[PDB]
Write a protein that holds these residues in place. Structure first.
Motif, PDB file in Angstrom:
ATOM      1  N   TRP C  82      -5.001   2.501  -6.176  1.00 48.29           N
ATOM      2  CA  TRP C  82      -6.315   2.836  -5.635  1.00 48.29           C
ATOM      3  C   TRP C  82      -6.392   2.534  -4.144  1.00 48.29           C
ATOM      4  O   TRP C  82      -6.962   3.318  -3.377  1.00 48.29           O
ATOM      5  CB  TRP C  82      -7.408   2.082  -6.392  1.00 48.29           C
ATOM      6  N   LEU C  83      -5.835   1.398  -3.717  1.00 48.93           N
ATOM      7  CA  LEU C  83      -5.882   1.036  -2.305  1.00 48.93           C
ATOM      8  C   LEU C  83      -5.124   2.038  -1.446  1.00 48.93           C
ATOM      9  O   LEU C  83      -5.575   2.394  -0.350  1.00 48.93           O
ATOM     10  CB  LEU C  83      -5.331  -0.375  -2.105  1.00 48.93           C
ATOM     11  N   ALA C  84      -3.965   2.496  -1.920  1.00 48.02           N
ATOM     12  CA  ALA C  84      -3.201   3.482  -1.163  1.00 48.02           C
ATOM     13  C   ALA C  84      -3.948   4.807  -1.064  1.00 48.02           C
ATOM     14  O   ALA C  84      -3.918   5.464  -0.016  1.00 48.02           O
ATOM     15  CB  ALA C  84      -1.828   3.684  -1.800  1.00 48.02           C
ATOM     16  N   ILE C  85      -4.621   5.214  -2.143  1.00 47.21           N
ATOM     17  CA  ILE C  85      -5.325   6.496  -2.150  1.00 47.21           C
ATOM     18  C   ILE C  85      -6.426   6.506  -1.096  1.00 47.21           C
ATOM     19  O   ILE C  85      -6.580   7.474  -0.342  1.00 47.21           O
ATOM     20  CB  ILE C  85      -5.881   6.794  -3.554  1.00 47.21           C
ATOM     21  N   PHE C  86      -7.208   5.426  -1.025  1.00 46.91           N
ATOM     22  CA  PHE C  86      -8.270   5.353  -0.026  1.00 46.91           C
ATOM     23  C   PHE C  86      -7.702   5.324   1.386  1.00 46.91           C
ATOM     24  O   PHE C  86      -8.278   5.918   2.305  1.00 46.91           O
ATOM     25  CB  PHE C  86      -9.146   4.125  -0.271  1.00 46.91           C
ATOM     26  N   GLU C  87      -6.577   4.632   1.580  1.00 43.15           N
ATOM     27  CA  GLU C  87      -5.984   4.538   2.911  1.00 43.15           C
ATOM     28  C   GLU C  87      -5.539   5.900   3.427  1.00 43.15           C
ATOM     29  O   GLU C  87      -5.509   6.120   4.644  1.00 43.15           O
ATOM     30  CB  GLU C  87      -4.810   3.560   2.893  1.00 43.15           C
ATOM     31  N   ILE C  88      -5.183   6.819   2.527  1.00 43.90           N
ATOM     32  CA  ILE C  88      -4.877   8.185   2.947  1.00 43.90           C
ATOM     33  C   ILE C  88      -6.118   8.848   3.528  1.00 43.90           C
ATOM     34  O   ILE C  88      -6.052   9.528   4.560  1.00 43.90           O
ATOM     35  CB  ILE C  88      -4.300   8.992   1.769  1.00 43.90           C
ATOM     36  N   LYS C  89      -7.270   8.660   2.878  1.00 45.54           N
ATOM     37  CA  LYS C  89      -8.519   9.201   3.401  1.00 45.54           C
ATOM     38  C   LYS C  89      -8.907   8.570   4.731  1.00 45.54           C
ATOM     39  O   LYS C  89      -9.625   9.197   5.516  1.00 45.54           O
ATOM     40  CB  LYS C  89      -9.647   9.003   2.386  1.00 45.54           C
ATOM     41  N   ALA C  90      -8.452   7.346   5.000  1.00 44.00           N
ATOM     42  CA  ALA C  90      -8.743   6.682   6.264  1.00 44.00           C
ATOM     43  C   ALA C  90      -7.838   7.143   7.398  1.00 44.00           C
ATOM     44  O   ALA C  90      -8.095   6.790   8.554  1.00 44.00           O
ATOM     45  CB  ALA C  90      -8.629   5.165   6.101  1.00 44.00           C
ATOM     46  N   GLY C  91      -6.794   7.914   7.100  1.00 43.46           N
ATOM     47  CA  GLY C  91      -5.892   8.409   8.116  1.00 43.46           C
ATOM     48  C   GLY C  91      -4.779   7.465   8.513  1.00 43.46           C
ATOM     49  O   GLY C  91      -3.954   7.831   9.359  1.00 43.46           O
ATOM     50  N   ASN C  92      -4.724   6.266   7.936  1.00 42.24           N
ATOM     51  CA  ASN C  92      -3.680   5.294   8.256  1.00 42.24           C
ATOM     52  C   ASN C  92      -2.565   5.451   7.231  1.00 42.24           C
ATOM     53  O   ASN C  92      -2.569   4.824   6.171  1.00 42.24           O
ATOM     54  CB  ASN C  92      -4.244   3.879   8.271  1.00 42.24           C
ATOM     55  N   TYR C  93      -1.594   6.309   7.553  1.00 41.54           N
ATOM     56  CA  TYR C  93      -0.503   6.583   6.624  1.00 41.54           C
ATOM     57  C   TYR C  93       0.513   5.447   6.593  1.00 41.54           C
ATOM     58  O   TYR C  93       1.077   5.148   5.535  1.00 41.54           O
ATOM     59  CB  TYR C  93       0.181   7.899   6.992  1.00 41.54           C
ATOM     60  N   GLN C  94       0.765   4.811   7.740  1.00 38.92           N
ATOM     61  CA  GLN C  94       1.737   3.723   7.783  1.00 38.92           C
ATOM     62  C   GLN C  94       1.277   2.534   6.948  1.00 38.92           C
ATOM     63  O   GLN C  94       2.075   1.939   6.213  1.00 38.92           O
ATOM     64  CB  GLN C  94       1.986   3.297   9.230  1.00 38.92           C
ATOM     65  N   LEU C  95      -0.005   2.176   7.043  1.00 32.54           N
ATOM     66  CA  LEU C  95      -0.531   1.056   6.271  1.00 32.54           C
ATOM     67  C   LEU C  95      -0.582   1.365   4.780  1.00 32.54           C
ATOM     68  O   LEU C  95      -0.642   0.439   3.965  1.00 32.54           O
ATOM     69  CB  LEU C  95      -1.922   0.678   6.791  1.00 32.54           C
ATOM     70  N   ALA C  96      -0.555   2.642   4.404  1.00 31.07           N
ATOM     71  CA  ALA C  96      -0.555   3.024   2.999  1.00 31.07           C
ATOM     72  C   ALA C  96       0.844   3.161   2.416  1.00 31.07           C
ATOM     73  O   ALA C  96       0.995   3.111   1.190  1.00 31.07           O
ATOM     74  CB  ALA C  96      -1.308   4.343   2.808  1.00 31.07           C
ATOM     75  N   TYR C  97       1.863   3.335   3.259  1.00 34.12           N
ATOM     76  CA  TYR C  97       3.212   3.568   2.754  1.00 34.12           C
ATOM     77  C   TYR C  97       3.777   2.333   2.061  1.00 34.12           C
ATOM     78  O   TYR C  97       4.420   2.445   1.012  1.00 34.12           O
ATOM     79  CB  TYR C  97       4.128   4.013   3.893  1.00 34.12           C
ATOM     80  N   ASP C  98       3.552   1.147   2.633  1.00 27.92           N
ATOM     81  CA  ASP C  98       4.113  -0.065   2.042  1.00 27.92           C
ATOM     82  C   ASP C  98       3.445  -0.409   0.718  1.00 27.92           C
ATOM     83  O   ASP C  98       4.048  -1.089  -0.120  1.00 27.92           O
ATOM     84  CB  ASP C  98       3.995  -1.235   3.022  1.00 27.92           C
TER      85      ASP C  98
END
Lengths: 37, 213, 125
Positions: C82-98
């Motif tokens: 869930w945290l990664a999915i929202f981070e995609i909507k925030a535009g921060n792809y690097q912070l979502a990759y890990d």
């Protein structure tokens, strides 16, 4: 360790098709020139 | 300490400061009649393995394996350099003797898997690499061979996670990262593969695989 | 206290259930035991439609995995996905990759969800 077989480049279909079309227009170039000459 | 320091120096990693290991090899060979020692021979075999001098593995480790055929330290390099030479009879003989010698060691099942995958029977190589990996978790050779079997089987989606987990389990080892980058080439995502080829090349300035990839 | 929160949650009293779980967190002697409450507490905020507020509790439930030398439990698997999915909507792809890679050791559906998310954020990385 076990060495992974290195990847090998492959002759694609698209580039060879491009070359055969280019050759076709190349031979079509002077056939009208011969008629002109 | 005059011999203990060189003797400890022999066993470090071989990728960096390679010339010093060679000078220490000759230092041990002279004035101490330790040229016949198995450890010096093993270090020499590993030197030859790194620079991919595979014929030299074959000759040297055949010279020492005749004297001792079950030196568990020496066998993985012999299996690798045999596979690279792509000969199946010698590997079959060694693996079948080892299976009836050390049934509960992971080395013998790893050798069996190498034999099957030299025979391109990937389906059995899957199981016989899984057994070796289960027997010894800290046997990165088994992990890499398992991922290789996955890649050669035909499907790559799982082999992706295979090389990912192999890279995560063994930080500081360039080869799993290189293989992961090669699979990334296979799936056509070059952006990431640039970075892993760079980190792999950071430590391996001269070897055919890095430059070819 | 935790049981009371479930009863309030199942009876449509989300306003009260938030304070109920919060009291339970303080009473817990060890931080480890708060992994279950954190994930459920975050869902109720999502039911209250304040996505910014639920982020702080989502950080804590994921962070307990690191504090427990990689516990890799089920209720943190849904947390990272869930945290990664929202981070995609925030535009921060690097912070979502890990986040996707750390959760690559869950269930069969968990790994593929993060694997595809990893490829998507990798391309935009």
């Amino acid at each position: 360790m076990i060495r992974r077989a290195p990847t090998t480049l492959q002759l694609s279909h698209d580039d060879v098709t491009s070359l055969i079309d280019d050759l076709n227009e190349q031979k079509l170039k002077q056939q009208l020139n011969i008629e002109k000459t | 300490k005059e011999i203990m320091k060189n003797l400890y120096k022999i066993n470090l990693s071989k990728y960096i400061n390679t010339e010093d290991i060679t000078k220490s090899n000759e230092i041990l060979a002279k004035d101490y009649k330790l040229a016949d020692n198995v450890d010096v021979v093993r270090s020499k075999v590993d030197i030859c393995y790194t620079q991919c001098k595979f014929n030299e593995c074959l000759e040297l480790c055949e010279t020492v394996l005749e004297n001792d055929e079950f030196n568990t330290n020496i066998l993985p390099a012999y299996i690798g350099c045999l596979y690279e030479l792509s000969n199946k009879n010698k590997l079959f003989l060694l693996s079948h003797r080892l299976a009836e010698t050390f049934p509960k060691s992971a080395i013998t099942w790893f050798s069996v898997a190498t034999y099957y995958m030299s025979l391109d029977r990937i389906s059995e190589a899957q199981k016989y690499y899984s057994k070796s990996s289960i027997l010894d978790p800290s046997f990165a050779a088994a992990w890499l061979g398992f991922a290789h079997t996955y890649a050669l089987e035909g499907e790559q989606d799982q082999a992706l996670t295979a090389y990912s987990t192999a890279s995560r389990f063994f930080p500081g080892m360039h080869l799993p990262k290189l293989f992961l980058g090669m699979q990334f080439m296979a799936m056509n995502s070059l952006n990431l593969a640039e970075s892993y080829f760079v980190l792999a090349y950071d430590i391996c300035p001269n070897d055919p695989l890095v430059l070819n990839e | 206290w935790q049981v009371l929160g479930e009863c309030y949650s199942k009876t449509g009293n989300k306003v009260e259930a938030i304070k109920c779980y919060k009291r339970s967190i303080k009473a817990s002697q060890t931080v480890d035991q708060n992994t279950s409450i954190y994930y459920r507490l975050a869902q109720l905020y999502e039911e209250l439609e304040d996505l910014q507020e639920c982020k702080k509790f989502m950080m804590k439930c994921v962070d307990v995995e690191e504090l427990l030398e990689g516990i890799v439990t089920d209720e943190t698997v849904k947390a990272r996905l869930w945290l990664a999915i929202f981070e995609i909507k925030a535009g921060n792809y690097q912070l979502a990759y890990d986040y996707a890679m750390g959760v690559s050791s869950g269930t069969s559906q968990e790994i593929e969800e993060a694997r595809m998310l990893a490829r998507e954020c990798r391309r935009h990385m």
